[PDB]
Amino acid sequence: DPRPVFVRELYTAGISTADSIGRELLRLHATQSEGSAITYAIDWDTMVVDPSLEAVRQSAFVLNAQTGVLTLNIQPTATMHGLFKFEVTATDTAGAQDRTDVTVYVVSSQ
Numbered sequence: 093d094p095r096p097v098f099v100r101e102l103y104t105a106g107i108s109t110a111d112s113i114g115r116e117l118l119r120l121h122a123t124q125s126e127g128s129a130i131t132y133a134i135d136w137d138t139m140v141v142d143p144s145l146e147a148v149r150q151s152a153f154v155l156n157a158q159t160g161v162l163t164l165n166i167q168p169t170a171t172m173h174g175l176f177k178f179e180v181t182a183t184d185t186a187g188a189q190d191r192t193d194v195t196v197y198v199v200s201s202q
C-alpha cells in the first residue's frame with residue numbers, strides 16, 4: 093500500500109508577542125516507500141481558531157508545500173488569545189494522502 097506516512101500524528105508549537113514574521117514553527121515530514129515526492133498542504137476546511145484570531149484565521153501561517161516548514165506569517169499582538177487547530181495533508185504524485193493534526197497555542201506573555 094504505497095502512500096505517504098507522517099512521522100507524527102500531532103505537531104504542536106507556541107507563538108507569542110515576542111515572535112517576529114518568518115519564525116519557523118515546525119517541520120512536517122511524511123515518508124513514501126517508493127520515493128514519490130510529497131506535497132504538504134493546510135486543509136483550510138479544518139482550521140478552528142479562538143474568536144480573537146478570526147482576522148488572522150487564513151493569514152497566520154504559511155506552509156511550504158515541498159519542505160513541510162510551517163512559518164509564522166503575522167506579528168502576534170496582546171489581543172490574540174487561545175489556539176489554532178488544523179489538519180495538514182501529505183499527497184504523493186499518485187494522489188495518495190496522509191493527514192496529521194497541528195495545534196498552535198498563543199502563549200501568554202508580559
Ligand SMILES: [Mg+2]
Nearest residue numbers: 098189190191
Ligand atoms: Mg493515516
